[PDB]
Amino acid sequence: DSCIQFTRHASDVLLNLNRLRSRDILTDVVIVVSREQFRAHKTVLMACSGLFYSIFTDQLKCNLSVINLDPEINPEGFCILLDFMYTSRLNLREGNIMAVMATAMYLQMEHVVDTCRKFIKASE
Amino acid sequence: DSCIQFTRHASDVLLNLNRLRSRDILTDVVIVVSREQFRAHKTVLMACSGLFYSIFTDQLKCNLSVINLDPEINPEGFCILLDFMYTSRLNLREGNIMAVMATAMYLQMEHVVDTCRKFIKASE
Amino acid sequence: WVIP
Amino acid sequence: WVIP
Ligand SMILES: O=C1Cc2cc(Nc3nc(Cl)ncc3F)ccc2N1
Ligand SMILES: O=C1Cc2cc(Nc3nc(Cl)ncc3F)ccc2N1
Ligand SMILES: [Cl-]
Ligand SMILES: [Cl-]
């Protein structure tokens, strides 16, 4: 086509979606990771994660307001990945990289799994 | 912080949100623009438009599944802006610029109003 | 704004 | 991935 494109649009959209999350505006699901609870927007979770895409495209699961993750999932790892979904920034540290990578494999977030693998390889 | 950032994340999120819109997945509102109907995600509309942000933060309107726009709004202008919200690309043409600018003023989409004003000024 |  |  002959469209023009606003370079910062996608980043500005994501920033506003994170502001809605902050302010608990139109959040429509609670993700439970053992004793912790995280509120989010199903559409953002599906856009970032192959696991959430599969969950919320299922004709029964699409209607659930609570999703319980596998008990082996680390809440801090999940929190770091949820923040990445809404900001593009990943708080990857020596002390959390193993939990983050395991969580990203479970959630099916291939670019995160890729940077974790590279950071681990560099320390070996 | 000491975060790393994935450059393409925001663009990839927006592309996936447009794929959900295409496939009518988790759309939760119908915008009516006279005889036409447009299905969308409230969160994407709020992230892009000051008018939708005000509508869906209202304690009564947040619960509506149908929103009727002012009868003066042009459906083609709205369609072009809805596509821009989900893609960052604006199909601005000599034949639609006046309707697009009027619609963007109503929807409170300041960057669009800005490029329309500039394109109009250049032709004068 | 740019030409994509 | 970059240093933001
Ligand atoms: O590593 C990843 C990230 C990821 C996100 C999605 N999300 C969607 N995919 C499509 Cl094709 N349309 C809409 C979506 F919301 C699916 C798989 C995967 N795998
Ligand atoms: O030209 C524009 C585009 C636009 C979008 C929004 N959206 C939101 N703003 C904030 Cl601060 N937090 C969350 C949001 F969804 C508000 C006003 C305006 N004016
Ligand atoms: Cl990813
Ligand atoms: Cl805009």
Short mmCIF file of C-alpha atoms and ligand atoms in Angstrom, two decimals:
data_model
loop_
_atom_site.label_atom_id
_atom_site.label_comp_id
_atom_site.label_asym_id
_atom_site.label_seq_id
_atom_site.Cartn_x
_atom_site.Cartn_y
_atom_site.Cartn_z
CA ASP A 1 0.00 0.00 0.00
CA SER A 2 0.87 3.76 0.10
CA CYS A 3 0.54 4.04 3.94
CA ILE A 4 2.74 6.30 6.16
CA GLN A 5 3.87 4.81 9.50
CA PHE A 6 4.32 6.37 12.95
CA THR A 7 7.57 4.84 14.26
CA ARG A 8 6.79 5.13 18.01
CA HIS A 9 3.15 3.88 17.76
CA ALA A 10 3.72 0.26 18.88
CA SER A 11 5.93 1.35 21.82
CA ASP A 12 3.37 4.02 22.86
CA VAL A 13 0.55 1.40 22.70
CA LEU A 14 2.52 -0.99 24.91
CA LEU A 15 3.34 1.83 27.39
CA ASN A 16 -0.39 2.63 27.64
CA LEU A 17 -1.30 -1.07 28.10
CA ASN A 18 1.23 -1.20 30.98
CA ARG A 19 -0.37 1.98 32.48
CA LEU A 20 -3.78 0.21 32.32
CA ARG A 21 -2.21 -2.84 34.07
CA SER A 22 -0.66 -0.55 36.80
CA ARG A 23 -4.01 1.07 37.39
CA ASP A 24 -5.88 -2.34 37.23
CA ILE A 25 -8.02 -1.03 34.34
CA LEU A 26 -9.89 -3.68 32.31
CA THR A 27 -7.68 -6.53 33.60
CA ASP A 28 -9.69 -9.70 32.95
CA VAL A 29 -7.66 -12.59 34.35
CA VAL A 30 -5.70 -13.58 37.46
CA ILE A 31 -2.66 -15.82 36.91
CA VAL A 32 -1.91 -17.87 40.04
CA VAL A 33 1.72 -19.00 40.58
CA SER A 34 1.47 -20.98 43.85
CA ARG A 35 0.81 -18.42 46.68
CA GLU A 36 1.08 -15.35 44.38
CA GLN A 37 -1.56 -13.72 42.10
CA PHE A 38 -0.92 -11.54 39.03
CA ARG A 39 -3.65 -9.53 37.30
CA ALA A 40 -3.32 -9.02 33.53
CA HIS A 41 -5.08 -8.59 30.18
CA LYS A 42 -5.70 -11.92 28.33
CA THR A 43 -4.93 -10.29 24.96
CA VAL A 44 -1.48 -9.08 26.08
CA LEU A 45 -0.68 -12.52 27.56
CA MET A 46 -1.75 -14.23 24.27
CA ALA A 47 0.25 -11.76 22.15
CA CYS A 48 3.45 -12.61 24.12
CA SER A 49 3.20 -16.31 25.03
CA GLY A 50 2.49 -19.44 23.00
CA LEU A 51 1.06 -21.08 26.15
CA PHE A 52 -1.43 -18.23 26.83
CA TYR A 53 -2.32 -18.08 23.11
CA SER A 54 -3.28 -21.81 23.30
CA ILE A 55 -5.15 -21.36 26.65
CA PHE A 56 -7.28 -18.41 25.64
CA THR A 57 -8.11 -19.78 22.12
CA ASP A 58 -9.58 -22.90 23.79
CA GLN A 59 -13.41 -22.71 23.70
CA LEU A 60 -13.69 -23.60 27.45
CA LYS A 61 -10.57 -21.93 28.90
CA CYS A 62 -11.17 -18.60 27.09
CA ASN A 63 -13.96 -17.98 29.67
CA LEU A 64 -11.95 -18.59 32.85
CA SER A 65 -11.06 -15.57 35.05
CA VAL A 66 -8.35 -17.53 36.95
CA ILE A 67 -5.51 -19.64 35.49
CA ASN A 68 -3.31 -21.74 37.79
CA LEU A 69 0.21 -22.37 36.52
CA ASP A 70 2.22 -25.57 37.18
CA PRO A 71 3.45 -25.60 40.86
CA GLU A 72 7.06 -25.87 39.63
CA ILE A 73 6.87 -22.32 38.21
CA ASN A 74 8.74 -19.68 40.20
CA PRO A 75 6.59 -16.57 41.02
CA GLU A 76 9.60 -14.17 40.68
CA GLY A 77 10.42 -15.67 37.24
CA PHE A 78 6.78 -15.20 36.20
CA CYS A 79 6.76 -11.60 37.53
CA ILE A 80 9.93 -10.74 35.52
CA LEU A 81 8.35 -12.21 32.35
CA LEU A 82 5.01 -10.44 32.91
CA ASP A 83 6.91 -7.13 33.24
CA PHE A 84 8.79 -7.97 30.00
CA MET A 85 5.48 -8.63 28.20
CA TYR A 86 4.24 -5.15 29.07
CA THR A 87 7.51 -3.20 28.66
CA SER A 88 9.96 -5.07 26.28
CA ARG A 89 12.50 -4.94 29.17
CA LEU A 90 13.82 -8.10 30.79
CA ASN A 91 15.38 -7.96 34.28
CA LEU A 92 17.85 -10.79 33.70
CA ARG A 93 20.33 -11.37 36.57
CA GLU A 94 22.75 -14.16 37.57
CA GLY A 95 20.43 -14.96 40.51
CA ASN A 96 17.24 -15.30 38.42
CA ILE A 97 18.36 -16.49 34.94
CA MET A 98 17.66 -20.19 35.56
CA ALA A 99 14.09 -19.49 36.87
CA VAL A 100 13.45 -16.96 34.07
CA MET A 101 14.59 -19.39 31.34
CA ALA A 102 12.52 -22.28 32.79
CA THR A 103 9.44 -20.01 33.01
CA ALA A 104 9.95 -18.70 29.43
CA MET A 105 10.22 -22.30 28.13
CA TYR A 106 6.93 -23.19 29.89
CA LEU A 107 5.20 -19.99 28.67
CA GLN A 108 6.63 -20.52 25.14
CA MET A 109 8.39 -17.11 24.83
CA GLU A 110 11.10 -18.10 22.26
CA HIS A 111 13.04 -14.76 22.13
CA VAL A 112 13.46 -14.78 25.93
CA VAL A 113 14.54 -18.47 25.90
CA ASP A 114 17.11 -17.43 23.21
CA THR A 115 18.72 -14.56 25.22
CA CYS A 116 18.82 -16.75 28.40
CA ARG A 117 20.60 -19.56 26.49
CA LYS A 118 23.16 -17.02 25.13
CA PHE A 119 23.82 -15.43 28.59
CA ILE A 120 24.26 -18.90 30.18
CA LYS A 121 26.63 -20.05 27.37
CA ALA A 122 28.79 -16.89 27.91
CA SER A 123 29.34 -17.76 31.63
CA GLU A 124 30.43 -21.38 30.84
CA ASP B 1 17.53 -0.67 36.22
CA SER B 2 19.97 -3.15 34.55
CA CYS B 3 17.31 -4.59 32.13
CA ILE B 4 18.03 -5.72 28.52
CA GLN B 5 15.40 -4.81 25.90
CA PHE B 6 14.10 -6.70 22.85
CA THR B 7 13.80 -4.03 20.13
CA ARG B 8 11.01 -5.70 18.09
CA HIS B 9 8.83 -6.69 21.11
CA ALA B 10 6.28 -3.84 20.94
CA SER B 11 5.86 -4.24 17.14
CA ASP B 12 5.48 -8.05 17.51
CA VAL B 13 2.84 -7.53 20.27
CA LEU B 14 0.87 -5.15 18.06
CA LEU B 15 1.10 -7.56 15.08
CA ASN B 16 -0.32 -10.35 17.28
CA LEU B 17 -3.12 -8.08 18.60
CA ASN B 18 -4.05 -7.33 14.94
CA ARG B 19 -4.03 -11.12 14.20
CA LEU B 20 -6.45 -11.60 17.14
CA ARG B 21 -8.66 -8.80 15.70
CA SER B 22 -8.58 -10.46 12.19
CA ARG B 23 -9.59 -13.76 13.68
CA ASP B 24 -12.23 -12.10 15.99
CA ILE B 25 -10.47 -13.55 19.06
CA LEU B 26 -11.40 -11.98 22.43
CA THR B 27 -12.88 -8.86 20.79
CA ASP B 28 -15.13 -7.33 23.47
CA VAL B 29 -16.80 -4.29 21.90
CA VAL B 30 -18.62 -3.26 18.72
CA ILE B 31 -18.12 0.36 17.59
CA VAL B 32 -21.10 1.54 15.52
CA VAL B 33 -20.47 4.32 12.94
CA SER B 34 -23.95 4.86 11.45
CA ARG B 35 -24.78 1.72 9.33
CA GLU B 36 -21.34 0.08 9.87
CA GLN B 37 -20.04 -2.06 12.79
CA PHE B 38 -16.40 -2.59 13.81
CA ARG B 39 -15.31 -5.23 16.33
CA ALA B 40 -12.26 -4.43 18.49
CA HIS B 41 -10.50 -4.86 21.84
CA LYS B 42 -11.37 -2.12 24.39
CA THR B 43 -7.76 -2.06 25.67
CA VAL B 44 -6.30 -1.37 22.22
CA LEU B 45 -8.89 1.38 21.59
CA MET B 46 -8.06 3.00 25.00
CA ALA B 47 -4.29 2.75 24.36
CA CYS B 48 -4.69 4.69 21.05
CA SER B 49 -7.51 7.20 21.61
CA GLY B 50 -8.18 9.80 24.30
CA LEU B 51 -11.93 9.44 23.62
CA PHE B 52 -11.93 5.62 24.13
CA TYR B 53 -9.68 6.01 27.19
CA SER B 54 -12.34 8.34 28.73
CA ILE B 55 -15.24 6.04 27.66
CA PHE B 56 -13.86 2.80 29.03
CA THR B 57 -12.57 4.35 32.32
CA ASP B 58 -16.14 5.53 33.06
CA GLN B 59 -17.70 3.25 35.72
CA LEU B 60 -20.92 2.79 33.65
CA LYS B 61 -19.58 2.85 30.06
CA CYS B 62 -16.73 0.39 30.80
CA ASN B 63 -19.44 -2.36 30.84
CA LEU B 64 -21.07 -1.60 27.48
CA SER B 65 -20.50 -4.06 24.59
CA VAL B 66 -21.69 -1.52 21.96
CA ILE B 67 -20.57 2.13 21.53
CA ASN B 68 -22.35 4.39 19.03
CA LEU B 69 -20.23 7.20 17.61
CA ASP B 70 -21.57 10.65 16.63
CA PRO B 71 -23.58 10.38 13.32
CA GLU B 72 -21.24 12.96 11.72
CA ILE B 73 -18.35 10.45 11.85
CA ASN B 74 -17.40 8.89 8.52
CA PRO B 75 -17.20 5.03 8.62
CA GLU B 76 -14.26 4.93 6.13
CA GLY B 77 -12.34 7.48 8.26
CA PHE B 78 -13.01 5.36 11.35
CA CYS B 79 -11.91 2.17 9.52
CA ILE B 80 -8.61 3.81 8.44
CA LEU B 81 -7.96 4.92 12.05
CA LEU B 82 -8.86 1.51 13.51
CA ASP B 83 -6.37 -0.11 11.09
CA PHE B 84 -3.75 2.48 12.18
CA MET B 85 -4.36 1.62 15.85
CA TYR B 86 -3.58 -2.04 15.20
CA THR B 87 -0.72 -1.62 12.68
CA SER B 88 0.99 1.86 13.08
CA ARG B 89 0.21 2.41 9.35
CA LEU B 90 -2.09 5.19 8.20
CA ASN B 91 -3.72 5.02 4.74
CA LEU B 92 -3.79 8.78 4.17
CA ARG B 93 -4.98 9.85 0.69
CA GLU B 94 -6.14 13.13 -0.90
CA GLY B 95 -9.67 11.67 -1.05
CA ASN B 96 -9.86 10.71 2.64
CA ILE B 97 -7.61 13.19 4.52
CA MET B 98 -10.44 15.53 5.58
CA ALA B 99 -12.57 12.63 6.99
CA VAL B 100 -9.50 11.04 8.63
CA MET B 101 -8.45 14.32 10.32
CA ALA B 102 -12.02 15.04 11.55
CA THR B 103 -12.29 11.47 12.93
CA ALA B 104 -8.84 11.68 14.62
CA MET B 105 -9.84 15.01 16.27
CA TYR B 106 -13.05 13.38 17.61
CA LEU B 107 -11.19 10.23 18.78
CA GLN B 108 -8.39 12.39 20.29
CA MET B 109 -5.47 10.80 18.37
CA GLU B 110 -3.02 13.78 18.47
CA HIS B 111 -0.17 12.28 16.32
CA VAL B 112 -2.63 11.52 13.49
CA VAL B 113 -4.19 15.03 13.74
CA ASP B 114 -0.58 16.37 13.50
CA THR B 115 0.36 14.49 10.26
CA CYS B 116 -3.02 15.41 8.65
CA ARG B 117 -2.47 19.12 9.45
CA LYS B 118 1.06 18.93 7.90
CA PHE B 119 -0.15 17.13 4.70
CA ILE B 120 -3.00 19.67 4.27
CA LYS B 121 -0.62 22.66 4.81
CA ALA B 122 1.76 21.24 2.10
CA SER B 123 -1.06 21.24 -0.54
CA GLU B 124 -2.05 24.90 0.21
CA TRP C 1 6.19 9.54 10.54
CA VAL C 2 8.09 7.60 7.82
CA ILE C 3 7.63 5.75 4.52
CA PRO C 4 7.59 2.11 5.81
CA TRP D 1 18.39 -7.50 22.32
CA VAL D 2 20.04 -4.18 23.35
CA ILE D 3 21.08 -2.11 26.37
CA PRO D 4 18.13 0.38 26.51
O1 LIG E 1 7.40 -17.51 21.43
C1 LIG E 1 6.22 -17.30 21.16
C2 LIG E 1 5.46 -16.01 21.40
C3 LIG E 1 4.09 -16.33 20.88
C4 LIG E 1 2.93 -15.57 20.78
C5 LIG E 1 1.83 -16.09 20.10
N1 LIG E 1 0.74 -15.23 19.90
C6 LIG E 1 -0.10 -15.18 18.86
N2 LIG E 1 0.30 -15.77 17.72
C7 LIG E 1 -0.44 -15.53 16.65
CL1 LIG E 1 0.12 -16.30 15.19
N3 LIG E 1 -1.51 -14.78 16.52
C8 LIG E 1 -1.87 -14.14 17.64
C9 LIG E 1 -1.19 -14.30 18.83
F1 LIG E 1 -1.61 -13.69 19.94
C10 LIG E 1 1.84 -17.41 19.65
C11 LIG E 1 2.97 -18.20 19.80
C12 LIG E 1 4.10 -17.64 20.40
N4 LIG E 1 5.37 -18.19 20.59
O1 LIG E 2 -3.79 11.46 21.43
C1 LIG E 2 -4.01 10.71 22.37
C2 LIG E 2 -3.81 9.21 22.40
C3 LIG E 2 -4.24 8.83 23.78
C4 LIG E 2 -4.28 7.61 24.45
C5 LIG E 2 -4.59 7.58 25.80
N1 LIG E 2 -4.47 6.35 26.46
C6 LIG E 2 -4.10 6.12 27.73
N2 LIG E 2 -3.46 7.11 28.37
C7 LIG E 2 -2.92 6.80 29.53
CL1 LIG E 2 -2.09 8.10 30.33
N3 LIG E 2 -2.89 5.64 30.16
C8 LIG E 2 -3.47 4.63 29.49
C9 LIG E 2 -4.08 4.83 28.27
F1 LIG E 2 -4.69 3.81 27.65
C10 LIG E 2 -5.02 8.74 26.45
C11 LIG E 2 -5.05 9.96 25.78
C12 LIG E 2 -4.64 9.99 24.44
N4 LIG E 2 -4.51 11.08 23.58
CL CL E 3 9.68 -13.74 23.72
CL CL E 4 -2.23 9.17 17.31
#
